[PDB]
């Protein structure tokens, strides 16, 4: 066929019931993730092609960057709780990988302060139980698919995107193939 298992995607041998429809995993320490967000804008282009009524979920992972990796999952929970993903995603990526000015939870916090979230508001969220369960969700979702690498994308808990089997000579074309594959998988 045109979309074949093991080519543009793989199938999970152990499907995950009740999983979010479109589930993306990343790490701020992850170089291809930097590309995916900053250069390719994958999340955004996928969204633009998803059918109506399909929600998109993005989670951070712990298994890169040790102690700071975990802080970044908690900060991403804070970002989700406050609804400020679109204001911190870029400075977090650049702070870890470009400028390398993010070395501690305090430096992570600085990014939110600069993005205009109030100290009081950031600290209250950081320490909230709502953020603790949002952290739990992120971990549980990664555990459910025994995730060992990022970037990763899963559709309906049963299919996993396989970007290795796509042409990367032209970046625009790669992105559209990626998005179209997610759309195909979505309607499956």
* Contact present, 171 and 32 (Cβ < 8 Å): no
Annotate 15-38 with b (16+ C-beta within 10 A) or e (fewer): ebeebbbbbbbbbbbbeebbebbe
Q: What is the CA radius of gyration of the chain?
A: 17
| Tokens 């939870």 -> residue | 105
Q: How far apart are alpha carbons 85 and 79 in whole angstroms?
A: 5
| Tokens 């990988």 -> residue | 97
Close Cβ partners of 178 (under 8 Å, ≥ 6 residues apart)? 42, 45, 46, 161, 163, 166
User: CB neighbours (10 Å) of residue 159?
Assistant: 22
* Contact present, 21 and 55 (Cβ < 8 Å): yes
* Contact present, 30 and 64 (Cβ < 8 Å): yes
User: CA angle, corner 176, sides to 175 and 180, nearest 5?
Assistant: 120
Helix axes 66-82, 119-126, angle to 10 degrees: 110
Q: How far apart are alpha carbons 111 and 88 in whole angstroms?
A: 7
| Tokens 């209250």 -> residue | 124
> Is the previous residue joined to 151 through a cis bond, with omega within 30 degrees of 0?
yes
Return the half-sphere exposure (C-beta side, CA atoms, 13 A cut-off) of residue 20.
16
- The alpha carbon torsion through 188, 20, 37, 182 (nearest 10 deg) reads 0
Annotate 85-124 with b (16+ C-beta within 10 A) or e (fewer): eebbbebbbbbbbeeeebeebebbbbbbeebebeeeebee
Q: How far apart are alpha carbons 34 and 40 in whole angstroms?
A: 9
User: CB neighbours (10 Å) of residue 58?
Assistant: 20
Overall CATH class of domain 1-188: alpha beta
Q: Assign 22 to helix, strand or coil.
A: strand
Return the half-sphere exposure (C-beta side, CA atoms, 13 A cut-off) of residue 112.
28
Structure tokens at 184: 């195909």
Helix axes 105-114, 85-93, angle to 10 degrees: 130
- Provide the pairing of β-strand 152-155 with 9-11: unpaired
């Amino acid at each position: 066929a045109q979309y074949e298992d093991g080519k543009q995607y793989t199938t999970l041998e152990k499907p995950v019931a009740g999983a979010p429809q479109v589930l993306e995993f990343f790490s701020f320490f992850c170089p291809h993730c930097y590309q995916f967000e900053e250069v390719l804008h994958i999340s955004d282009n996928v969204k633009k092609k998803l059918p109506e009524g399909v929600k998109m979920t993005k989670y951070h992972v712990n298994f890169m960057g040790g102690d700071l990796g975990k802080d970044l999952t908690q900060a991403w929970a804070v970002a989700m709780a406050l609804g400020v993903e679109d204001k911190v995603t870029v400075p977090l990526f650049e702070g870890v990988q470009k400028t390398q000015t993010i070395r501690s939870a305090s430096d992570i916090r600085d990014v939110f302060i600069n993005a205009g979230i109030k100290g009081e508001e950031y600290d209250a969220a950081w320490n909230s139980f709502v953020v603790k369960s949002l952290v739990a969700q992120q971990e549980k979702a990664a555990a459910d698919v025994q995730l060992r690498g990022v970037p990763a994308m899963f559709v309906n808990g049963k299919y996993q995107l396989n970007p290795q089997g796509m042409d990367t000579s032209n970046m625009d074309v790669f992105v559209q193939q990626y998005a179209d594959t997610v759309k195909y998988l979505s309607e499956k």
